[PDB]
Subunit: 316 residues, 2 copies
């Protein structure tokens, strides 16, 4: 049990790096590994990693979570924030196992919107043990030479004492890289759903079959070992997400830009204005426009620190 994700993240990283159970090479990727590992977070909203040596990217973290909420499998959207994710696209256009959006909202088994069914299940029986979003699909292992097999099995939500608890079940999790964005996204979905249901945030449980540090990340993991997040507004945030996704697409494609004062004047809750400002900052970097230091100064300090460490030549 940990208070924040960063404490759990660093504890687990130390366990795997210094006390691995196995050394092996699944699909040729040499790794340190432990089997059957998990942790509990008492405060899932505190979902960010701020250790400067880790250079956690809060823009990618929100982008991935909103990519899921958009229901999209398109590579162009997410590789803009994480160019290396193109390695898992067989067609150069879409992602399969990596794209949890379609798994949540139009699952390959029947096209089912599982998020809606979970909300209906919890509304009809608040104590339900059945409110599960299935991610994995049985046909993924029937694909020959599949380069992108879902590694999350399911997400479960439970309403307990007026709080929404969440459980993420994964068959495998990269303890150094993937875990940072997976726990961010799963606790983001948990909070989003809690707000929608009018509930407080309960605990988050992460449970993983194989937790591992790839040997190719050993040096960076060692640098990290040698070294408040704001709350989403109450209620139904879908209208805000739709507007943020509109700004996301226009900024990513450089079809729009917004100054610091334009951002502050957007008709959005402050929480979501800051997410749009992250995307405008990222546009300045990727499309080589003038970095806006007034933009940076208006962000929450957690975001300011992420930007200054990720892009010190722009925001440092």
């Amino acid at each position: 049990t940990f208070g924040t994700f960063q404490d759990a993240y660093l504890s687990q990283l130390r366990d795997i790096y210094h006390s691995p159970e196995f050394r092996n090479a699944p699909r040729g990727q040499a790794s340190r590994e432990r089997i059957g590992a998990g942790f509990r977070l008492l405060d899932p909203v505190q979902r960010h990693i701020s250790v400067p040596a880790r250079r956690a990217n809060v823009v990618f973290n929100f982008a991935e979570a909103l990519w899921y909420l958009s229901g999209s499998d398109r590579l162009d959207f997410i590789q803009y924030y994480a160019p290396g994710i193109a390695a898992y696209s067989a067609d150069g256009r879409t992602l399969r196992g990596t794209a949890y959006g379609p798994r949540i909202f139009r699952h390959p088994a029947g096209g089912v919107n599982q998020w809606e069914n979970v909300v209906k299940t919890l509304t009809d029986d608040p104590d339900s043990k059945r409110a599960v979003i299935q991610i994995f699909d049985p046909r993924e292992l029937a694909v020959a030479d599949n380069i992108d097999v879902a590694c999350t099995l399911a997400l479960q939500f439970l309403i307990r004492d007026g709080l929404l608890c969440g459980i993420g079940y994964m068959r495998a999790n990269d303890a150094f890289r993937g875990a940072v964005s997976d726990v961010f996204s799963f606790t983001f979905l948990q909070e989003f759903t809690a707000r929608y249901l009018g509930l407080g945030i309960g605990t988050y449980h992460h449970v993983v079959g194989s937790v591992h540090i790839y040997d190719s990340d050993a040096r960076w993991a060692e640098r990290v070992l040698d070294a408040g997040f704001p709350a989403m507004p109450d209620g139904d945030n879908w209208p805000h997400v739709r507007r943020v996704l509109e700004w996301e697409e226009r900024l990513r494609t450089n079809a729009a830009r917004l100054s610091a004062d334009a951002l502050d004047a957007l008709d959005l809750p402050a929480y979501w204005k800051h997410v749009v400002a992250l995307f405008e900052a990222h546009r300045q970097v990727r499309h080589e426009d003038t970095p806006d230091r007034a933009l940076l100064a208006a962000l929450p300090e957690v975001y300011r620190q992420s930007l200054a460490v990720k892009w010190p030549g722009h925001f440092g």
Copy 2:
């Protein structure tokens, strides 16, 4: 971490009973509950409960596991061993979420034999992290008033240091009743698969979203709280033996045949599977009111004799 399932079972039972995180009533079923609970077994073959107050039914244990291997969803097979299970059959003929057989061997999401794909995956890449059998299906929540939604999410197998390790992921588990047969079945499938792959047995991990004791079981669970090795399955491909065992299972369940102690010893089966068919003949004696055979009983492994003697003491005690 526990040496045997019985140690983990009793420890989890006492944890839920004495220190439940929640008391609630999903679908109106009042319970004591803990969230996100798991354990690790070092010896998954030692999968049985031998506390007499629990009256664990090794015949049902093997019947459920073989029902899964048969790929069947039929109620008539399994309700013969567990009469109350018909409460989860909407049509009186089949089981849905309770029937893991079709989920393993012909999953409704594409008609996929996942066991075959797991064996192929682990043969092509022994270190694979992908060898997962999915059980739950997203369409199960799509219609209201479903009385039988799968509570197992997935089973994963990993080859680590030449040993087949298993992980069962469940969204919910009855810690007092269902967990006894679920862990039996999952570690049985683990051992079966390891023998097929020519591997030894590693660890088994059980992880469950909601683990609970139903209030209606509290009296029995209190009695259990107030209160011999399991044999190893033979090496190699046990499918041909399973097929023969299933032929005998149906003949005995329908009272179309009977097996004397000498008829059991003459079966063309490894000793391990002869004992399983003997369990079915003993069960036939119970269900069809035939003479309890003392000689059958004496030839069984000690673990099985104790289960029969406690469960049906007038027949086998």
